[PDB]
Amino acid sequence: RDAAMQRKLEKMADQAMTQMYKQARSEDKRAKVTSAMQTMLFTMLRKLD
Amino acid sequence: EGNCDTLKEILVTYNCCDDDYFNKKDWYDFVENPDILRVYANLGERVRQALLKTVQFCDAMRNAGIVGVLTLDNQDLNGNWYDFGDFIQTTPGSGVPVVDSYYSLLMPILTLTRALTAESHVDTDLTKPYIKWDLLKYDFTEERLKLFDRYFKYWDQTYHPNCVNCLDDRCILHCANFNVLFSTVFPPTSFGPLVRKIFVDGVPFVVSTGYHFRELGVVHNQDVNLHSSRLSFKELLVYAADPAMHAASGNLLLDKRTTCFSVAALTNN
Numbered sequence: 594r595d596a597a598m599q600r601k602l603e604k605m606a607d608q609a610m611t612q613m614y615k616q617a618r619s620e621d622k623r624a625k626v627t628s629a630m631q632t633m634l635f636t637m638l639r640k641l642d
Numbered sequence: 643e644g645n646c647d648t649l650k651e652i653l654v655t656y657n658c659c660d661d662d663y664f665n666k667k668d669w670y671d672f673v674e675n676p677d678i679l680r681v682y683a684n685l686g687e688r689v690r691q692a693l694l695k696t697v698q699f700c701d702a703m704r705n706a707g708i709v710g711v712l713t714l715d716n717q718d719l720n721g722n723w724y725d726f727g728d729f730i731q732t733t734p735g736s737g738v739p740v741v742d743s744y745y746s747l748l749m750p751i752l753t754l755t756r757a758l759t760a761e762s763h764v765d766t767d768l769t770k771p772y773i774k775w776d777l778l779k780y781d782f783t784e785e786r787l788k789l790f791d792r793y794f795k796y797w798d799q800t801y802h803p804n805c806v807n808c809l810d811d812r813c814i815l816h817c818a819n820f821n822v823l824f825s826t827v828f829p830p831t832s833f834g835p836l837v838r839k840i841f842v843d844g845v846p847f848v849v850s851t852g853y854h855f856r857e858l859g860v861v862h863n864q865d866v867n868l869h870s871s872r873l874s875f876k877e878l879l880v881y882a883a884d885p886a887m888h889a890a891s892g893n894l895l896l897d898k899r900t901t902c903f904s905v906a907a908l909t910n911n
């Protein structure tokens with residue numbers, strides 16, 4: 594038990610870590626692109642009024 | 643094209659083209675020899691006259707109080723009529739005709755010969771300038787209704803200049819059809835998105851709030867909000883994927899390479 598169960602605890606904890614890493618990088622990209630498009634909008638109008 | 647004799651006879655009988663035109667091979671094709679459109683067009687006025695005369699005849703029968711049906715084969719090319727073989731008589735001012743088969747058959751021609759362009763001239767004369775429409779006007783409703791009334795007077799079905807007011811779908815068809823024909827008259831710089839100035843966080847934007855479809859009439863967006871504080875994601879998106887702010891921030895373009903109506907350019911090269 595304890596020398597097989599404890600072997601699965603590590604596996605599951607580490608896959609949880611890697612998936613939270615991927616989710617973090619994902620939501621990072623989101624912030625980046627939304628900042629970029631906001632900048633594009635705000636600079637577009639600044640040529641017409 | 644194996645035997646379109648009667649067509650050739652009709653075409654020469656009205657000076658749309660002279661028999662010489664019938665050796666330029668592929669004269670009948672469209673994508674080959676697009677010129678055929680022009681010689682087709684030289685029929686329009688005769689068709690339009692036929693229409694006006696049949697309107698007069700309809701109202702005449704209505705006042706007279708007669709009932710009957712209208713088949714094309716009982717109509718000359720000048721516009722007159724004849725063969726009152728089976729009409730029956732009723733009280734005057736109560737008569738009724740049947741113009742369902744007539745128009746339903748005629749409808750494809752009217753865009754083939756463009757027989758309705760004679761309504762874009764300053765006063766329905768071929769020998770006059772175009773009406774100088776106001777660059778800003780985009781509604782055009784009672785105009786379509788007026789046209790309908792001047793021609794399709796007895797097309798016994800309600801027409802809705804804006805399909806938004808249609809019932810089922812079949813009403814959408816029966817309205818967008820007429821819209822197709824009518825939209826050939828108005829300025830082509832008056833379709834597309836319908837933009838509007840808004841404010842957000844005390845800042846002016848230009849965004850579309852509607853559309854003028856040359857087949858669907860006017861349509862207004864239903865949930866526009868003047869004056870907001872910030873912008874979430876979906877609204878960022880829908881204001882990014884629109885041409886309004888893009889186009890209005892562009893430099894005017896006019897290209898002669900294409901007959902397609904250009905609009906704008908985003909760069910200097």
Ligand SMILES: [Zn+2]
Nearest residue numbers: 802808813817
């Ligand atoms: Zn309708």
